[PDB]
Design an enzyme around this catalytic site. Structure first.
Site, PDB file in Angstrom:
ATOM      1  N   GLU A  40     -47.609  -5.808  16.835  1.00  0.00           N
ATOM      2  CA  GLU A  40     -46.749  -5.949  15.697  1.00  0.00           C
ATOM      3  C   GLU A  40     -45.457  -6.695  16.081  1.00  0.00           C
ATOM      4  O   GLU A  40     -45.050  -7.642  15.401  1.00  0.00           O
ATOM      5  CB  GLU A  40     -46.408  -4.574  15.113  1.00  0.00           C
ATOM      6  N   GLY A  97     -41.633   0.156   7.034  1.00  0.00           N
ATOM      7  CA  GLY A  97     -41.458   1.423   6.315  1.00  0.00           C
ATOM      8  C   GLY A  97     -41.634   2.614   7.247  1.00  0.00           C
ATOM      9  O   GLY A  97     -40.957   3.676   7.051  1.00  0.00           O
ATOM     10  N   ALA A  98     -42.382   2.436   8.344  1.00  0.00           N
ATOM     11  CA  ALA A  98     -42.653   3.586   9.252  1.00  0.00           C
ATOM     12  C   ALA A  98     -42.342   3.327  10.757  1.00  0.00           C
ATOM     13  O   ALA A  98     -42.367   4.256  11.581  1.00  0.00           O
ATOM     14  CB  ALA A  98     -44.101   4.102   9.030  1.00  0.00           C
ATOM     15  N   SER A  99     -42.003   2.079  11.110  1.00  0.00           N
ATOM     16  CA  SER A  99     -41.537   1.737  12.512  1.00  0.00           C
ATOM     17  C   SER A  99     -40.622   0.595  12.479  1.00  0.00           C
ATOM     18  O   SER A  99     -40.558  -0.103  11.451  1.00  0.00           O
ATOM     19  CB  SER A  99     -42.694   1.409  13.481  1.00  0.00           C
ATOM     20  N   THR A 100     -39.909   0.371  13.609  1.00  0.00           N
ATOM     21  CA  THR A 100     -39.171  -0.827  13.729  1.00  0.00           C
ATOM     22  C   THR A 100     -39.357  -1.420  15.177  1.00  0.00           C
ATOM     23  O   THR A 100     -39.481  -0.639  16.170  1.00  0.00           O
ATOM     24  CB  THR A 100     -37.623  -0.542  13.521  1.00  0.00           C
ATOM     25  N   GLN A 101     -39.299  -2.760  15.283  1.00  0.00           N
ATOM     26  CA  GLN A 101     -39.727  -3.453  16.499  1.00  0.00           C
ATOM     27  C   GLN A 101     -38.531  -4.318  16.867  1.00  0.00           C
ATOM     28  O   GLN A 101     -37.860  -4.860  15.971  1.00  0.00           O
ATOM     29  CB  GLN A 101     -40.967  -4.392  16.286  1.00  0.00           C
TER      30      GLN A 101
END
Ligand SMILES: Cc1cccc(Nc2cc(S(=O)(=O)O)c(N)c3c2C(=O)c2ccccc2C3=O)c1
Ligand SMILES: Cc1cccc(Nc2cc(S(=O)(=O)O)c(N)c3c2C(=O)c2ccccc2C3=O)c1
Length: 406
Positions: free
Chosen positions: A128, A167-171
């Site tokens: 991702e 909406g559910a993780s950040t990279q």
């Protein structure tokens, strides 16, 4: 021209992108571009964990559009991919049988369209991050060897770091010259005969919607009011929603009111980031290894839309980390009626802008350790060369083998 389709199946929304490129020069950098897109109504595919047939069905209207967007005589030859991200990774961790039913259902639906269906897969957190970095740098032509005989630019063209808030993780993903201290965070890419050493990390449960659910559980425990919500705003909180998420484990209805308290909102937020220990030489937060951030960065998806709310609706500059910080306080301090007086439009999530904006500011300064100097190189952007920035393009480019390694 040739075409290719990616379904981006995110935690709370599915998106369809159709890309187009000349058949005759398809391995050139920057060549592939966005032709069209489609937003799926309703929630993300993981939301159908308990009625998995609905997940394949939710995709029909956009698939119908892809049939109109892609000329008939190229349907056959046009690859179709579905990649799922943190919502499906989460669903995988709590219910691998429901996860596999969801993916079977979507596979069901896709394989009967006349496109060259190549599979529905869950991206890792590394994929991702890495594919969003590819997408940014491909569209902004950073893989070009700049100059001419013999006045070549030295050293190699710098690349853009990528921060992606879903909406559910950040990279976060960037090229680095620091030694790796954790191989899970180490990336080596070979693009147009060049070696790129890249750091990447995905924070699961640190996406915008999961952050809001964790803030709501802590506001309920500590305060019984929501400091990040505006004074004169209240709602019926459904405890089922809050406490069913794998992200709040470690914390049926309650009335909850906003108090427009920026300091206490900031207190709640900063508690999301554990900085008390670091077993590496340097960390971002939660003991995670991260080298000093460096180079230019593009911050996209929900980073863009939240900053655009601040600059457009609130009318505040966010040029410096400090203007960012002051923009967040001023927003959090507005009452419900003051918010409405700026005529912001029918925004269903108006009460949450303050929390998200505060989360972004904490993430960048307390989590990733940007300061004024390094944040000067961050731009908030959602499009490049008329293409949505995200992991979809770089994903398709890798599966389709459009970037030569040499
Ligand atoms: C696919 C697509 C194309 C153009 C605009 C949108 N709208 C959006 C798309 C995304 S996305 O998930 O990063 O795609 C997204 N994260 C947002 C939006 C939004 O439109 C939006 C509007 C108001 C507040 C926040 C958002 C927002 O976070 C979605
Ligand atoms: C502040 C906040 C908190 C949690 C989720 C969102 N997302 C959104 C909020 C709005 S809003 O009505 O303007 O409030 C909104 N219009 C959108 C989103 C979205 O997240 C979104 C995602 C994908 C396509 C479109 C949208 C979108 O239009 C915004």
């Amino acid at each position: 021209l040739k075409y290719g389709i990616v379904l981006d199946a995110g935690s709370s929304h599915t998106s369809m992108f159709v890309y187009k490129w000349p058949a005759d020069k398809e391995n050139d950098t920057g060549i592939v571009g966005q032709h069209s897109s489609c937003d799926v109504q309703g929630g993300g595919i993981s939301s159908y964990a308990n009625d998995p047939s609905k997940a394949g069905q939710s995709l029909v209207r956009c698939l119908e559009q892809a049939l109109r967007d892609v000329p008939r005589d190229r349907h056959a030859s046009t690859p179709l991919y579905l990649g799922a991200t943190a919502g499906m990774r989460l669903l995988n961790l709590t219910s691998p049988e429901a996860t596999a039913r969801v993916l079977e259902a979507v596979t069901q639906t896709l394989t009967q369209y006349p496109f060259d269906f190549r599979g529905a897969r869950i991206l890792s957190g590394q994929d991702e991050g890495v594919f969003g970095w590819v997408t940014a740098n491909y569209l902004l032509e950073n893989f070009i060897k700049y100059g001419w005989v013999g006045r070549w630019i030295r050293p190699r063209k710098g690349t853009l770091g990528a921060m992606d808030l879903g909406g559910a993780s950040t990279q976060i993903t960037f090229e680095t010259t620091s030694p790796s201290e954790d191989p899970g965070n180490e990336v080596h890419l070979r693009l147009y005969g060049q070696h790129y050493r890249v750091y990447t990390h995905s924070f699961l449960c640190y996406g915008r919607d999961q952050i809001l659910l964790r803030l709501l559980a802590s506001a309920l425990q500590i305060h019984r009011f929501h400091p990040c919500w505006p004074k004169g705003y209240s709602t019926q909180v459904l405890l089922q929603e809050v406490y069913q998420s794998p992200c709040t484990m470690g914390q049926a209805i309650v009335s909850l009111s906003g108090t427009s308290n920026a300091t206490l909102c900031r207190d709640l937020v900063s508690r999301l980031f554990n900085i008390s220990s670091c077993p590496f030489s340097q960390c971002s937060f939660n003991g995670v290894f991260q080298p000093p951030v460096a180079g230019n960065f593009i911050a996209f998806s929900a980073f863009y839309y939240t900053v655009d709310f601040l600059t457009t609706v609130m009318g505040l500059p966010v040029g410096t980390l400090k203007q960012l910080e002051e923009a967040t306080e001023i927003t959090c301090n507005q009452t419900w009626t003051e918010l409405q007086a700026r005529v912001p439009g029918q925004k269903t999530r108006l009460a949450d802008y303050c929390a998200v904006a505060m989360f972004i500011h904490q993430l960048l300064s307390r989590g990733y350790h940007f300061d004024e100097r390094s944040f000067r190189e961050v731009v908030f952007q959602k499009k490049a060369a008329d293409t949505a920035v995200g992991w979809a393009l770089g994903y398709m480019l890798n599966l389709t083998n459009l970037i030569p390694a040499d």
